[PDB]
From a paper:
Strigolactones (SLs) and karrikins (KARs) are two classes of structurally related molecules that mediate signaling pathways to stimulate seed germination. SL and KAR have been reported to be recognized by the homologous proteins D14 (DWARF14)14–17 and HTL (HYPOSENSITIVE TO LIGHT; also known as KAI2, KARRIKIN INSENSITIVE2), respectively. To elucidate the structural basis of ligand specificity, we determined the crystal structures of ShHTL1, ShHTL4, ShHTL7, and ShD14 and compared their structures with those reported for ShHTL331 and ShHTL529. All the structures were highly similar to one another, consisting of a canonical α/β hydrolase domain and a helical cap.
Y150 was changed to F150 in a subgroup (ShHTL4, ShHTL5, and ShHTL7) of the divergent clade, thus losing the hydrogen bond between helices αD1 and αD3. Therefore, helices αD1 and αD2 of ShHTL4, ShHTL5, and ShHTL7 slid away from αD3, resulting in larger pockets with a reduced chance of causing steric hindrance with ligands. This finding is interesting because ShHTL4, ShHTL5, and ShHTL7 have been shown to be highly sensitive to various natural SLs (polyspecific receptors) in a previous study. In the divergent clade (ShHTL4, ShHTL5, and ShHTL7), ShHTL7 had the largest pocket. For example, ShHTL7, with the largest pocket, had the helix αD1 tilting the greatest extent away from the entrance of the pocket. Structural analyses revealed that although the cap domains of ShHTL7 could overlay well with those of ShHTL4 and ShHTL5, with a root-mean-square deviation (RMSD) of 0.9 Å, ShHTL7 had more non-bulky residues than ShHTL4 and ShHTL5, such as T142, L153, and T157. It is reasoned that ShHTL7 evolved to use smaller residues to enlarge its pocket while sustaining activity. To verify the importance of pocket size for ligand recognition of ShHTLs, a double mutation T190F/C194F and a triple mutation L124F/T190F/C194F of ShHTL7 were generated to introduce large side-chain amino acids to reduce the pocket size by partially mimicking ShHTL3. The inhibition constant Kirac-GR24 in the YLG competition assays was used to indicate the rac-GR24 binding affinity of ShHTL7. It is shown that the T190F/C194F mutation led to a twofold decrease, and the L124F/T190F/C194F mutation led to more than a 100-fold decrease in the rac-GR24 binding affinity. Our results showed that rac-GR24 triggered the interaction of ShHTL7 with ShMAX2, which was consistent with the results of a previous study.
Author numbering: 2 to 268
């Protein structure tokens, strides 16, 4: 399988229903290592690495394909078809779940529901939409980017994860963050910050479980309610007693039981 190897696909567990696990920026499928053992006896589990992750071949990273989020959506579709999966339960962190939302638009037959950890359709504020970052504030960061990539990559990590440099979560996050090729991570960073999925949320019809931290510098709690009001299908919002943008990594004791509930229960 050329597509399975390029994305380091792993298949665990068994069952009529498949849980697909998609990771966020700067991580890979190993971020799910504490959730997977609670799924394998009741579901088949599919794990894949998004293109551009440190565990994938840099040469495969097409800068135009992955300058728009649906480039990732098409990869997900190709993986699901290759491994004979339909009507899956997709669990995704951050733009991975947004890539699966758009994937569900193209191929509703591939998704039974979406469990979304810290999703946002747009980071930039406008006159009606508070994404958490003013245009001027975001612009004077992206110009920094490759000239000061190390400082931005690591310097924003403690605020993003909301945990210490000595913590295991920060250590594990930086382990995978530091393996990305800088020009790939700048391209992906520039796509996420420039993303505006708001015009298309009404065409997402698959049920969506929106899981949030009560304090996420990247996702204001109102962004979750915005998603819920603008998705075209059913949705539920759960704001966890967590902080940081990667609560499945930094606070698994709270987050994993929440994720399992939304995996097991339908809206
Ligand atoms: Mg071959
Ligand atoms: Mg992300």
């Amino acid at each position: 399988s050329s597509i399975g190897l390029a994305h380091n696909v792993t298949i665990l567990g068994s069952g009529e229903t498949t849980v697909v696990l998609g990771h966020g920026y700067g991580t890979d499928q190993s971020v799910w290592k504490l959730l997977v053992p609670y799924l394998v006896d009741d579901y088949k589990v599919l794990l894949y690495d998004h293109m551009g992750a440190g565990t994938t071949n840099p040469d495969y990273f097409d800068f135009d394909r992955y300058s728009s989020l649906e480039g990732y959506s098409y990869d997900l579709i190709a993986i699901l078809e290759e491994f004979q999966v339909s009507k899956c339960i997709y669990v995704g962190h951050s733009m991975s779940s947004m890539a699966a939302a758009v994937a569900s638009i193209f191929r509703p037959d591939l998704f039974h529901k979406l469990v979304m950890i810290s999703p946002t359709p747009r980071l930039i504020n406008t006159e009606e939409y508070y994404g958490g970052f003013e245009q001027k504030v975001m612009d004077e960061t992206l110009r920094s980017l490759d000239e000061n990539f190390k400082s931005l990559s690591l310097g924003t990590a403690p605020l993003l994860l909301a945990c210490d440099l000595e913590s295991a979560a920060m250590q594990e996050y930086c382990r995978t963050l530091f393996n990305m090729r800088p020009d790939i991570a700048c391209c992906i960073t520039r796509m996420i910050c420039g993303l505006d999925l708001r015009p298309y949320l009404g065409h997402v019809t698959v049920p969506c479980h929106i899981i949030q931290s009560s304090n996420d510098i990247m996702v204001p709690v109102a962004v979750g309610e915005y998603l819920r009001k603008n998705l075209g299908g059913p949705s539920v919002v759960e704001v966890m007693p967590t902080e940081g943008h990667l609560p499945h990594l930094s606070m698994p004791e709270v987050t994993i039981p929440v994720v399992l509930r939304h995996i097991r229960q339908d809206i």
